[PDB]
Amino acid sequence: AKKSMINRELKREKEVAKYADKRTKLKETISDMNASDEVRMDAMLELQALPRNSSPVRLRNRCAITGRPHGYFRKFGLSRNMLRERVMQGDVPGVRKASW
Amino acid sequence: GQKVHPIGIRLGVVKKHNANWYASPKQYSEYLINDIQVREYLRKKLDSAMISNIMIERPTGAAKITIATARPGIVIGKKGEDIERLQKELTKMMGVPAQVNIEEITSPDLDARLVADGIGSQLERRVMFRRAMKRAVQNSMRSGAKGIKVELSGRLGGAEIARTEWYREGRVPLHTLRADIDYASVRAETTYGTIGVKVWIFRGE
Amino acid sequence: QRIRIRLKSFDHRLIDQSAQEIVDTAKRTGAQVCGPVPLPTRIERFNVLTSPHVNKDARDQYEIRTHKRMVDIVQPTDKTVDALMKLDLAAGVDVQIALG
Amino acid sequence: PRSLKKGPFIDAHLFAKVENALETNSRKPIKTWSRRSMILPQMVGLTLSVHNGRTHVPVIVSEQMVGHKLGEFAPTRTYR
Amino acid sequence: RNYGTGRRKTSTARVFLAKGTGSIVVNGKPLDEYFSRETSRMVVRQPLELLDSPTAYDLYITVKGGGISGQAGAIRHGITRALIELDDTNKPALKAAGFVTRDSRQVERKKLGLRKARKRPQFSKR
Amino acid sequence: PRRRVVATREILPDPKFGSQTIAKFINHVMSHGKKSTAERIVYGALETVAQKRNIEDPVAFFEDVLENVRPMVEVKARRVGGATYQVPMEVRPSRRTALAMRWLAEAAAKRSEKSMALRLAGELSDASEGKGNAMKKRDEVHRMADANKAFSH
RNA sequence: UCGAUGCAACGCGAAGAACCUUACCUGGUCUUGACAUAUCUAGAAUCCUGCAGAGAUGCGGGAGUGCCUUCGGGAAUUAGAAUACAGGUGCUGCAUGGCUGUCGUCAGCUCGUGUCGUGAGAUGUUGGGUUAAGUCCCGCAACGAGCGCAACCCUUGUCCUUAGUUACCAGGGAACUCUAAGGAUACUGCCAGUGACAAACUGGAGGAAGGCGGGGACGACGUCAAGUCAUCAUGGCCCUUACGACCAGGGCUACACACGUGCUACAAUGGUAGGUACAGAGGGCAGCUACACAGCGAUGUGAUGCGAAUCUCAAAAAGCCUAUCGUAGUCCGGAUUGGAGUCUGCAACUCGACUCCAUGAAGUAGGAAUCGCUAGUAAUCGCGGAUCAGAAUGCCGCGGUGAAU
């Protein structure tokens, strides 16, 4: 993909890493039943006031090598194209052609 | 485009993976990405010394990289001062010590990657493709390969229409699963485009 | 003190020898050991499109097996534990120790 | 729709524009792009200018439009 | 106490032959209660009855896996394996019936691009 | 196929009569691989006709109706130099039984009785005396064979 | 938005568009730039903040002073000072590499030497058989070889051996199933015939398996200037305060229409309501949840076990027994619409999936035409997984029942 889009994913993940802990504590606060109703309402208001890219939902998994969004595998972290290239070269441990 | 990778189809029957570690489903992706990064860095850096079989096996953080080259002397350096820099550069972009222990190819005419990269270098030196191909065939055959096939594909000699040429000597039986066929595919960036070089070296059973 | 060693790898002919020498070194030190039980290997399959653009009908089917073995030292000895801690096996096989 | 336990959703930036509009009791059409904010009876009576992708079409809010999202009255596609 | 092991497409059964009245207990339950299929009941009781001895041997079957008819086939195979144990003269008759052969038929795998093992999608010339 | 003649499969008999003929008819009634449903349809039909006709052994009655439905001469298309000739030929016994069973099932599938088992029993009864759509189809096939009766190639 | 266009485009790239993805439109913005190297000015980076704005961004206040060498200072680091440049999913698949489809898993396709012909070429490779096969045998101016076929690989079918937990239960046991490694067997091996004294074929025994036991992967030389410059790489052409870059909203989801793939049906071989059974495979800390309570339900709260042969997803459904419906546009069908909710998520209007109540549309078997399938197959029934915060009727698999010819 475009170098701009790769850097855009990087800067989108930077904010996620920067606000990872704040989101966790705030989420526990808003889901706390013992917490006061106005307290959890204000905490949720802050959560909706957080910067947009801080959410781990706007993150799109991309191939590490090519940056391709479509055809991604979590276990390997690469798009289907270069995944096949490296498996066939033998660079990917354990993985081989299957038949049954 | 109708042929299976000779290495890949033989990955479990007679060949072995050139990456021998184990990971957990979550750790495996980052191990693989770091592995590919190290491989591309090595293949760009040691582009002078003819390395062909960099193998990555990482036991519990510490890794044991094993590069096999036809010219270990140049890549090791004087008293071993280039190898230490390579060691620390590997360690910097991996986790913890990457012990790179370096093998030696005692027959560079039987390794497909060395043959392919030699033909590629000759092609980028504006050498006749037919002569480079025939020279590689002769070299491998008289060095003792039971068979060699070399395919040159692209705008050969500046030709506007790309074409595929190839020479075969010996057997090189691709469909035999136990055939011990080394295979390499490289590219020569000439002044008219990319010329693909494929080399099959069949060595036994 | 009944220790349990658990071996997990991708190569099935690596765990066989890894467990073979573990059981041999734990039975040659005057200790009784039960043979390496094999636990059901996990096979993960992947469907990777081979064409770079189109014709979804063409794809490679890959698999990765995760083989697992287990050995138990029913009665341990000091001459078994010392010889076991020196048996530094790695590079392909994960070994987990129950230690009890 | 949404969850009742979560509560009504209104964007903070437009909620500030209406807390700076119902005290003042102005009739200036508040120009907004957040179509994802639900009309609450707090600003019932006044006017907003909701972006429909191309322009900021005017929506005068009424008494029977509360509970809806601001975009419901700003169609984006043109059939004919 | 003759012991037989029978196998079918996915079910595996282990049968225990012992001379008795003719009662058959499958998975700690009577055969009729276990098998609501009349065909399955016949399939289980067939190896006993082709050679004219249904009420001669007590059977203790334990089945696992498979389906209602796969388990019946597995029990038939195991009963044949146990019958050949007490007497080898019954083996020719069992072979002529075709009960000693283990049906190797298995579910054919689904292939790539095919909707099933062999079912392909609709084809259009245009 | 084009080269060999396959060895036919063995069909195990029906559980409640022990007859491969009734088993094969149960197969012809079957759909979606439901042996139990087909078997109860056929058994309901058989018990209905047996209780109505006061016959102790109905397998012989089924053989009688089957041989009554079976045709003997079927018309086959032949090609001789571009001419399509409808030559009447004999029916091999396996095809005889298959055609009879298929005709019985397809005729019983279109009647007006409430249950399919009742429909099948009524059709068996009707073809026993010599009526019903199975009989009409057999008569139609015989009619075409006799209508040609002029090509003995 | 772009590509794919006869077979071999049309549930195709896309293994999953609310934002993101995103490549398109509207508007708001930046110009060595979001990203690499050359550089010199200050600072450890880094953290917490206020306001304005839709956000990108803009203007301000506090804490910290790294580490090794030490007064040259260095791996990283924030804001530019400028030239190189970067960047481009912009164009040319008819300049290309790599990758793929397809004829076609069809049995072919060639070469060396010899010989024949002025020659292009021929022979071999043709012929008699035989085979799934240029498979094999015998003939034969051919003699040989190579890539293809076959075999070697994986899975399943029987047995043996090592092993017995978290697996198993015949009498704690080391029997059995199972699990997962290593092997045994199968070779036309034996018998009878037919066959050129052949290859081979036909039948039979034994055996779990008989002739290629079943399934897969493996795709020759080449053909379509076949597909892909939008995975990637790359020759050339083109744009560099813009065709590059950032943000918000919208669109990719519009529908007089047409076609391609499907799903659900049109019911009685069925619908509904009660009981009662029988799987496999796969997933689970980026989680699955025992159990209890609350709720009509989706779900919610507490809590337990489990990185799993231990705990869980999870109950398999079709099936069987009883009752009922009794052929009706219905107790069939479940679209569409109204209302009220639950989750995921900053956010469900455009434009989510489920839940509940109400509604109840077409549809009663489908024209010309046309498709798949030869056995555990078709048909039918459920169950998993990839992608994935959420979002399968698609894709990839699993087992159940199970034909006709």
Side-chain angles (χ1 to χ4, degrees):
Chain A
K2 272 193 286 193
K3 198 99 149 193
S4 49
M5 209 93 48
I6 305 146
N7 304 334
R8 173 184 317 166
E9 161 185 40
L10 264 296
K11 70 104 169 180
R12 187 159 299 140
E13 201 193 88
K14 203 82 199 55
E15 294 190 358
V16 171
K18 187 160 72 76
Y19 298 138
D21 52 358
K22 195 169 298 149
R23 282 182 173 269
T24 302
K25 312 303 295 319
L26 194 153
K27 185 68 69 175
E28 275 311 272
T29 299
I30 71 146
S31 175
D32 204 358
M33 44 295 279
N34 207 346
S36 183
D37 183 21
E38 60 260 19
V39 164
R40 55 156 51 161
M41 281 322 115
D42 177 278
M44 262 200 316
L45 281 192
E46 178 63 30
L47 177 84
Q48 314 169 345
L50 287 175
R52 201 84 89 76
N53 291 327
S54 59
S55 65
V57 160
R58 284 166 75 89
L59 282 194
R60 189 35 182 274
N61 274 346
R62 296 184 114 100
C63 163
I65 303 323
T66 36
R68 218 184 87 119
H70 269 314
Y72 177 91
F73 292 81
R74 276 159 187 218
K75 191 193 181 85
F76 305 117
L78 324 154
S79 75
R80 53 177 191 75
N81 304 277
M82 321 279 254
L83 169 62
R84 175 154 182 281
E85 313 208 353
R86 304 273 163 194
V87 178
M88 281 333 258
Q89 296 179 45
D91 288 12
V92 176
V95 173
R96 54 178 304 203
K97 292 266 270 144
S99 34
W100 69 98
Chain B
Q2 40 202 137
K3 264 148 206 93
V4 74
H5 205 275
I7 294 315
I9 195 80
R10 273 154 194 103
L11 260 174
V13 28
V14 295
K15 312 216 143 293
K16 86 169 190 326
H17 286 87
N18 52 22
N20 188 13
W21 39 266
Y22 173 90
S24 83
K26 200 171 73 261
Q27 171 132 30
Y28 185 114
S29 171
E30 76 214 343
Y31 268 176
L32 193 64
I33 300 156
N34 216 3
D35 187 349
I36 270 44
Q37 283 178 29
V38 152
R39 281 226 177 61
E40 87 210 319
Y41 152 78
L42 270 207
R43 292 241 144 95
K44 152 185 281 222
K45 174 93 36 182
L46 319 182
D47 227 12
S48 76
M50 26 207 72
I51 71 187
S52 90
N53 199 30
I54 140 83
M55 157 156 209
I56 323 236
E57 99 191 353
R58 25 166 115 231
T60 318
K64 332 267 156 199
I65 274 59
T66 300
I67 330 160
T69 164
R71 270 137 182 51
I74 164 175
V75 114
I76 291 204
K78 196 287 305 292
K79 141 190 55 43
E81 73 217 356
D82 280 285
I83 174 179
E84 302 328 309
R85 148 140 45 71
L86 178 78
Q87 245 278 14
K88 92 190 316 223
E89 190 61 9
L90 282 208
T91 267
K92 184 255 297 150
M93 59 109 54
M94 320 213 327
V96 305
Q99 186 35 51
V100 32
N101 40 305
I102 294 207
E103 239 227 48
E104 187 224 325
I105 293 166
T106 97
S107 42
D109 257 344
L110 275 278
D111 250 45
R113 174 160 243 113
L114 311 176
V115 181
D117 262 314
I119 309 171
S121 101
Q122 292 183 256
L123 259 357
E124 309 170 3
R125 296 198 268 100
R126 293 202 179 79
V127 172
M128 317 309 264
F129 74 95
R130 268 211 178 89
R131 280 207 183 304
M133 254 198 306
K134 271 140 165 213
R135 267 150 180 154
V137 175
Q138 298 176 50
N139 279 335
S140 157
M141 278 329 283
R142 88 178 81 243
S143 202
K146 253 152 164 198
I148 212 226
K149 180 168 51 140
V150 22
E151 184 174 300
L152 269 240
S153 147
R155 293 179 58 174
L156 303 142
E160 246 193 295
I161 280 156
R163 106 186 64 103
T164 311
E165 303 219 13
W166 54 280
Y167 298 118
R168 202 199 288 120
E169 274 257 7
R171 281 183 57 222
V172 55
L174 287 182
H175 282 225
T176 275
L177 255 9
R178 68 170 132 101
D180 183 10
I181 302 199
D182 194 26
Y183 161 87
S185 149
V186 308
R187 29 201 299 141
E189 300 313 321
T190 66
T191 203
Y192 280 103
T194 287
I195 279 158
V197 177
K198 301 217 185 123
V199 164
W200 297 261
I201 310 195
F202 161 72
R203 295 172 284 192
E205 288 293 57
Chain C
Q1 49 181 1
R2 191 260 305 152
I3 60 175
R4 185 180 292 270
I5 320 283
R6 292 187 194 149
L7 324 180
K8 288 177 74 176
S9 78
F10 298 149
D11 185 71
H12 66 92
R13 62 167 267 265
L14 263 177
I15 45 159
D16 196 1
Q17 58 173 28
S18 180
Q20 200 69 10
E21 80 171 3
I22 282 161
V23 70
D24 284 330
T25 196
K27 89 180 288 188
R28 277 183 47 85
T29 59
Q32 186 75 341
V33 180
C34 67
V37 317
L39 304 180
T41 88
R42 169 193 176 192
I43 310 147
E44 328 178 38
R45 300 223 167 88
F46 315 96
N47 296 134
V48 193
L49 293 192
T50 61
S51 180
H53 178 239
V54 78
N55 45 77
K56 194 185 164 78
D57 230 10
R59 79 174 80 230
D60 279 4
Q61 280 149 122
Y62 304 136
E63 82 184 5
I64 167 162
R65 288 187 169 85
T66 313
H67 308 258
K68 186 182 171 136
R69 306 257 181 293
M70 143 177 306
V71 300
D72 299 355
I73 316 300
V74 283
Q75 70 96 32
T77 44
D78 277 341
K79 50 194 308 201
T80 298
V81 177
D82 53 27
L84 192 141
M85 63 62 50
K86 272 196 280 205
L87 193 57
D88 294 300
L89 262 193
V93 187
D94 276 11
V95 293
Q96 312 292 75
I97 314 297
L99 188 74
Chain D
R2 203 194 220 266
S3 226
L4 293 194
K5 105 192 152 347
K6 255 205 189 148
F9 179 82
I10 187 92
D11 220 80
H13 83 279
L14 176 128
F15 201 39
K17 300 185 164 216
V18 279
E19 315 219 5
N20 312 326
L22 57 100
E23 293 50 27
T24 271
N25 287 126
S26 53
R27 300 294 86 134
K28 193 68 67 34
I30 328 184
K31 144 181 311 306
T32 168
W33 322 70
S34 147
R35 312 153 92 271
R36 66 236 218 51
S37 251
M38 158 165 45
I39 285 173
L40 352 94
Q42 273 55 289
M43 81 231 90
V44 66
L46 55 79
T47 307
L48 301 126
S49 208
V50 186
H51 192 219
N52 72 341
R54 217 192 328 192
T55 43
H56 272 276
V57 299
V59 179
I60 49 97
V61 314
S62 95
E63 201 271 305
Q64 72 285 11
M65 283 184 0
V66 342
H68 296 7
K69 310 283 269 223
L70 292 152
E72 295 215 32
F73 326 87
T76 68
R77 266 178 243 91
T78 143
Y79 185 24
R80 311 268 223 190
Chain E
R1 287 295 277 177
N2 303 123
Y3 168 52
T5 299
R7 291 162 202 280
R8 181 52 109 99
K9 33 215 271 183
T10 285
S11 68
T12 166
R14 24 193 266 204
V15 316
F16 288 92
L17 217 67
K19 278 74 60 182
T21 310
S23 90
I24 299 170
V25 175
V26 178
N27 285 20
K29 323 194 312 183
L31 182 176
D32 305 302
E33 160 180 308
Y34 193 66
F35 277 129
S36 72
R37 286 287 288 296
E38 184 66 27
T39 70
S40 298
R41 287 196 213 102
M42 188 241 273
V43 161
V44 184
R45 287 198 259 89
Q46 181 159 73
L48 315 148
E49 69 179 1
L50 83 154
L51 43 61
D52 298 323
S53 88
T55 78
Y57 317 121
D58 180 73
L59 292 164
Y60 174 78
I61 292 80
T62 296
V63 296
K64 213 155 178 214
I68 49 170
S69 58
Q71 283 183 354
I75 299 157
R76 211 198 49 188
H77 191 229
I79 288 170
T80 290
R81 297 286 201 74
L83 286 211
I84 67 160
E85 285 306 318
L86 57 94
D87 192 2
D88 314 329
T89 74
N90 302 120
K91 183 126 181 203
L94 278 175
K95 267 215 94 159
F99 301 157
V100 81
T101 165
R102 188 255 196 262
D103 288 330
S104 66
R105 297 134 104 197
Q106 54 145 41
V107 189
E108 222 225 75
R109 83 166 254 194
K110 172 188 153 35
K111 323 278 181 53
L112 200 287
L114 266 39
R115 294 189 69 190
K116 287 169 66 129
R118 292 168 188 256
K119 207 244 215 132
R120 307 173 70 270
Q122 207 153 261
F123 158 83
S124 196
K125 226 191 253 222
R126 261 111 238 131
Chain F
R2 202 193 278 275
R3 297 174 302 194
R4 71 74 65 101
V5 194
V6 291
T8 180
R9 300 181 181 86
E10 59 87 64
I11 178 65
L12 64 96
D14 54 349
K16 163 178 138 309
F17 296 106
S19 65
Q20 291 169 353
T21 304
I22 299 297
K24 171 60 76 134
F25 185 58
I26 277 144
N27 282 323
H28 277 271
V29 169
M30 194 208 285
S31 211
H32 317 294
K34 315 242 261 183
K35 269 274 208 43
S36 294
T37 316
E39 272 165 9
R40 67 179 56 192
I41 296 300
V42 175
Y43 288 159
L46 290 177
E47 58 76 14
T48 289
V49 288
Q51 185 268 335
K52 186 219 58 46
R53 207 162 290 219
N54 293 319
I55 183 174
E56 286 70 16
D57 198 0
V59 297
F61 168 65
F62 194 77
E63 305 327 270
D64 195 3
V65 61
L66 213 48
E67 287 119 27
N68 164 329
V69 178
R70 265 170 252 211
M72 319 81 60
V73 187
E74 199 196 28
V75 73
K76 181 138 161 63
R78 204 160 263 189
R79 208 266 325 167
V80 174
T84 306
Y85 285 168
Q86 287 275 53
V87 180
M89 320 221 320
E90 297 87 5
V91 177
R92 41 190 205 280
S94 82
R95 168 164 196 71
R96 239 165 244 180
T97 65
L99 272 184
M101 291 195 153
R102 179 185 304 124
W103 286 343
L104 288 172
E106 64 156 61
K110 294 157 33 50
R111 279 254 295 280
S112 287
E113 275 80 358
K114 263 310 171 91
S115 174
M116 172 69 199
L118 190 61
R119 272 211 275 292
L120 187 53
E123 265 285 349
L124 292 172
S125 65
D126 287 24
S128 168
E129 293 104 13
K131 324 152 306 312
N133 308 78
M135 224 37 50
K136 282 58 206 161
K137 189 60 35 154
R138 193 208 61 120
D139 272 336
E140 232 179 88
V141 166
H142 286 184
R143 183 182 175 182
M144 215 135 60
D146 192 293
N148 299 333
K149 204 196 214 174
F151 317 102
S152 69
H153 293 93

